Unconditional design. Structure first.
Lengths: 610, 374, 187
């Protein structure tokens, strides 16, 4: 499959006029983009490891053989230049993003924890203009906090094993995974893994993408710096609430790796100054607030590195021409189910519930236009209203994330308190939220949600301090003044607000300083992704993996059921059963089925077929 | 935007502390003074201005006569107070009260009219969606993150004492002691005349307040420190007036805060801050005394002097049973703890259903403050 | 499983003693008190809780007013008593009464309504396959391994005296004396 003949054979036809394929779905998207002159989005649900990007390379191969002719008569429609192939560096882009944003999880050894949005950009004449990569969602919590039997991002482990003295001495990371308190569960050596070579291939991939050795070392200094934060050990002082950090060495080691004076970092982190209109007064932080500030600085540094990295990746994706419109391709995780389901699992399920609601709305409009094309006015409920109650349970001022957001700012807050307050406030009023209620061994999990895939039972343990991301404006304002170019450029605000109404609170800044939860940032990024997707016409690919084995002729039925529940295919079948799913022509209905009813169907004068 | 946010304002006598909720430090801090021009001015092109509020009054001090509107926790004039709230909202904060729920702080054992008129001015002068009035000592407990403790709260307003146990409150064991930092200011100018330093107008009365908030300290034992004041050395300190007059103060310097522990010096029978704390603990139930003795919290503006915690620990340890260990938690930043307590309180989503709304005021009138809150 | 075990609960005034049949000693022993909060609390994020039962009431004692529900062997209020049995089953023991036969102890010369209402609460509040109510003094004789004896049984409930001879019982020679350890507390 995927030869020149097969792509030539599909061209310009409907999806029922040639066999099932991705190229057919991309033909619908390309033809709709040219016909209706609007942007489109391909949404691919994250099963494994499943070669999703490899199939997307075939989608890119399809777009290349279609889009060879536009406005410019003789524009090198064959070889483009000397070697004007595709963006073959899209292959090279994956190990860089994959190391940074994929991790070994209980579901798979390579699972994507970011929303990769590939924008293939076209002129008004259907030709390629260029491409950009955007990244939206990220499990930035996974850097600091992990599950009980999973790795953090691959980049950390492959850095630790790969890097020789040649680069280790410059980063001061020779101390192995037992030094770093943010590497939970220790090393997590996979049986017969060397790691090591994988980052030689990755470092070569970075250099092929045209980035300098200096940039590559500077990037890996900051992937050390995110880890180095967890080696800083604040000590709760006798009587005094504030605490202090006795051991300078880790701060001095961090100062060398960054840009900061140790004395000013130690003051700024322990006893920050806050702008009191227009003076600056110091604030006491408890030992818990200082550790949360260090965690927020780690999570926000990695977030900023990833956002810089995608921007820097776009700067090596050359743009030969202006662009008029785009095809989006979304590569993100699917809905996940584990035994132990924690906070990041609720966040993943929440994005999939909103993405699936967009599928349900698209299915509603597609059915409604088809009802009108056949002359049948029929009124029916939106299918996105099946999921609306689950979305509004998680979302909104009275929902799960808001109650978690209240509880993490409560002066003596507990995991038990969060669950009881949510029970009293919202559980007994919400059909899709269940409190299980058996004794231990039948209900280890602490509350249950009913989603499109079915019931998912959650363990609340540690959600409050996972949720916290409070960010000290003094420490951020030290990082803005960095003598190392890379860190100053990364910490260049990125919030836009100080341009809107000038230097005040005029609505253009969110909760920034104190407050700031991962749930708010996740909701904010998700709303940005959903607005960009809602501004396009979507098309849907659902990937399944038939086995763990990696070889065909075996299809594991239970795995296929779990994937069908999580990817929304089982929802789409229950949706079309609300409507009328089977649609047969008057000619076909007469010609295939005359044998039924000779008594009803008379003579050869009975033409018209209606 | 989500929550809209909220505004928190602390207005014990002497200092306004004000800003948004969930900001940890405030967004304005300035003195609660209204300064009117006593001397007629003869120039063309001046102002004119009826009065100067806050630090404009601090700056232009010598022309003026300065009035505190809040005396002993009681608002003595309400145009002067309205101008202070008008000034916070529109000069430093630059907000419309129409955007923001407003939390105000209020004092233990205060006349009902202070709550009832304060809610009327917030609802009918500066149009506001919702508001609340909250007891000062409970807010300072919230700032130090505690569920249990006895709070000794004292401004340039009055001294208040509230015992608290695992939340709750004991209304019969709340004590009010009418000694403020302001009475210490009047005591300080009265003692200074023994050394010939006569200060008589409100302008240099705040110069002795400025002396009070950085030269004064509490003697770690009074008679011992007064005895060594025979051999003047570290006990005397030079001080510079904005005049250029040099002022040197001695035993005088520590016998001004001593008045909190010896109210005989200001001529009042009313027992000292250690004794009033003991009086509250004796009114409290027998069991909860064990933790109240070991969870004494100090807040406010006139608990800022060096040696207060150390001295209160000696005097409470001497009076109390020594079978249990007296522990006082008097943090730095304690001048702002009532405001920090309000900024955390207004950031609680459960407390966002506990506001007094504009609609409830419009339906049921000013008296409803004591029907929903403390 | 064989036998299904059984649950045994002693609830003379002052102390609940509870656990499984087949043990020689109980799993939960705690005071028969229901402690309601007399003083209104002014904080946000507290509880609230109508009442504290057992040793939560012992711990948080000074805020509360404490009520014994059983006075002189008589149950004086039944929501307070239901809460004590709800607490034994679901907090310390962690059992469903649906799984277990429940044995309760009861006092010599007690009003019929104490047995008759006690069986109703066990059958209709906490669904149970079977139950029994048994006289306190005969149980203490069984514990002491004797077939014959005169039992002087006294709690913080009331003082009861039962003579027994080679099993049996003599109903006319059973004596009740309304002096308890609780009246000694007041004394």
């Amino acid at each position: 499959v995927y030869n020149p003949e097969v792509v030539a054979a599909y061209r310009g036809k409907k999806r029922q006029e040639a066999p099932p394929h991705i190229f057919s779905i991309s033909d619908n998207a390309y033809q709709f983009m040219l016909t209706d002159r609007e942007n489109q989005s391909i949404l691919i649900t994250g099963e494994s490891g499943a070669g999703k990007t490899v199939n997307t390379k075939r989608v890119i191969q399809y777009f290349a053989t279609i889009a060879v002719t536009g406005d410019k008569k003789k524009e090198e429609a064959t070889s483009g230049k000397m070697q004007g192939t595709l963006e073959d560096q899209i292959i090279s882009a994956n190990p860089l993003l994959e190391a940074f944003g994929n991790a070994k999880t209980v579901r798979n050894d390579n699972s994507s924890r970011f929303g990769k949005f590939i924008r293939i950009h076209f002129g008004a004449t259907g030709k390629l203009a260029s491409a950009d990569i955007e990244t939206y969602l990220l499990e930035k919590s996974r850097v600091t906090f992990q599950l009980k039997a999973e790795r953090s991002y691959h980049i950390f482990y492959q850095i630790m094993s790969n890097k020789k003295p040649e680069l280790i001495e410059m980063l001061l990371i020779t101390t192995n995974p037992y030094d770093f308190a943010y590497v939970s569960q220790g090393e997590i050596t996979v049986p017969s893994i060397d790691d090591q070579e994988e980052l030689m291939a990755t470092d070569t991939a970075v250099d092929i993408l045209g980035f300098s050795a200096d940039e590559k070392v500077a990037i890996y200094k900051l992937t050390g710096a995110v880890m180095h934060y967890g080696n800083m050990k604040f000590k709760q002082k006798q009587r005094e609430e504030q605490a202090e950090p006795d051991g300078t060495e880790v701060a001095d080691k961090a100062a060398y790796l960054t840009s900061l004076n140790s004395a000013d970092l130690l003051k700024a982190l322990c006893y920050p100054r806050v702008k009191v209109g227009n003076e600056y007064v110091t604030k006491g932080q408890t030992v818990q607030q200082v550790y949360n500030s260090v965690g927020a600085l780690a999570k926000s540094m990695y977030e900023k590195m990833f956002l810089w990295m995608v921007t820097r990746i776009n700067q090596q994706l050359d743009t030969k021409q202006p662009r008029q419109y785009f095809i989006g391709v979304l590569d993100i995780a699917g809905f996940e189910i584990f035994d132990f389901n924690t906070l990041e699992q609720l966040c993943i399920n929440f994005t999939n519930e909103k993405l699936q609601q967009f599928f349900n709305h698209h299915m509603f409009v597609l059915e409604q236009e088809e009802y009108k094309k056949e002359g049948i006015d029929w009124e029916f409920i939106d299918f996105g209203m099946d999921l609306a109650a689950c979305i509004e349970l998680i979302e909104k001022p009275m929902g799960i994330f808001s109650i978690l957001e209240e509880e993490c700012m409560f002066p003596k807050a507990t995991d038990t308190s969060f669950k009881n307050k949510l029970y009293e406030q919202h559980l007994g009023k919400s059909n899709n939220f269940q409190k299980p209620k058996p004794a231990k061994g039948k209900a280890e999990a602490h509350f249950s949600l009913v989603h499109y895939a079915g019931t998912v039972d959650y363990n609340i343990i540690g959600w409050l301090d996972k949720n916290k991301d409070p960010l000290n404006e003094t420490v951020v304002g030290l990082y803005q003044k960095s003598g190392l170019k890379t860190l100053a450029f990364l910490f260049s605000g990125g919030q836009a607000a100080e341009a809107e109404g000038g230097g005040g609170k005029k609505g253009g800044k969110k909760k920034g300083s104190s407050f700031q939860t991962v749930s708010a940032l996740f909701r904010e990024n998700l709303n940005k992704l959903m607005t960009n997707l809602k501004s396009t016409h979507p098309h849907f690919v659902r990937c399944l993996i038939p086995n763990e084995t990696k070889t065909p002729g075996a299809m594991e039925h239970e795995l296929v059921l779990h994937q069908l529940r999580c990817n929304g295919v089982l929802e789409g079948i229950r949706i079309c059963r609300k409507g009328f799913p089977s649609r047969i022509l008057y000619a076909d209905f007469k010609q295939r089925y005359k044998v039924l009813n000779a008594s009803a169907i008379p003579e050869g004068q009975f033409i018209d077929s209606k | 935007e989500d929550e809209t946010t909220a505004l928190v304002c602390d207005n014990g006598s002497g200092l306004v502390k004000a800003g948004f909720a969930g900001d940890d430090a405030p967004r304005a801090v300035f003195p609660s003074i209204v300064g009117r021009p006593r001397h007629q001015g003869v120039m063309v092109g001046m102002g004119q201005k009826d009065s100067y509020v806050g630090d404009e009054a601090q700056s232009k001090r010598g022309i003026l006569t300065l009035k505190y509107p809040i005396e002993h926790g009681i608002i003595t004039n309400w145009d002067d107070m309205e101008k202070i709230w008008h000034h916070t909202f529109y000069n430093e904060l630059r907000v419309a009260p129409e955007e923001h729920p407003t939390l105000l702080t209020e004092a233990p054992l205060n006349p009902k009219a202070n709550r009832e008129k304060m809610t009327q001015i917030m609802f009918e002068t500066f149009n506001v969606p919702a508001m609340y009035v909250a007891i000062q000592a409970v807010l300072s407990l919230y700032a130090s993150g505690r569920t249990t403790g006895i709070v000794l709260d004292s401004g340039d307003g009055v001294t208040h004492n509230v015992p608290i146990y695992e939340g709750y409150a004991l209304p019969h064991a709340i004590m009010r002691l009418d000694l403020a930092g302001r009475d210490l200011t009047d005591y300080l100018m009265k003692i200074l005349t023994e050394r010939g330093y006569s200060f008589v107008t409100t302008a240099e009365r705040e110069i002795v307040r400025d002396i009070k908030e950085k030269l004064c300290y509490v003697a770690l034992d009074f008679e011992n420190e007064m005895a060594t004041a025979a051999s003047s050395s570290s006990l005397e300190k030079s001080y510079e007036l904005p005049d250029g007059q040099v002022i040197t103060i001695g035993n005088e310097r520590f016998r001004c805060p001593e008045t909190l522990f010896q109210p005989s010096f200001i001529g009042m029978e009313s027992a000292g801050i250690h004794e009033t704390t003991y009086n509250s603990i004796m009114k409290c139930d027998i069991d909860i005394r064990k933790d109240l003795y070991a969870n004494n919290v100090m807040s406010g503006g006139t608990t800022m002097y060096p040696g207060i915690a150390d001295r209160m620990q000696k005097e409470i340890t001497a009076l109390a049973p020594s079978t249990m260990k007296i522990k006082i938690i008097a943090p730095p930043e304690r001048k702002y703890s009532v405001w920090i307590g309000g900024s955390i309180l207004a950031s609680l989503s459960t407390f966002q259903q506990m506001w007094i709304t504009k609609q409830e005021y419009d339906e049921a009138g000013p008296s409803i403050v004591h029907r929903k809150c403390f």
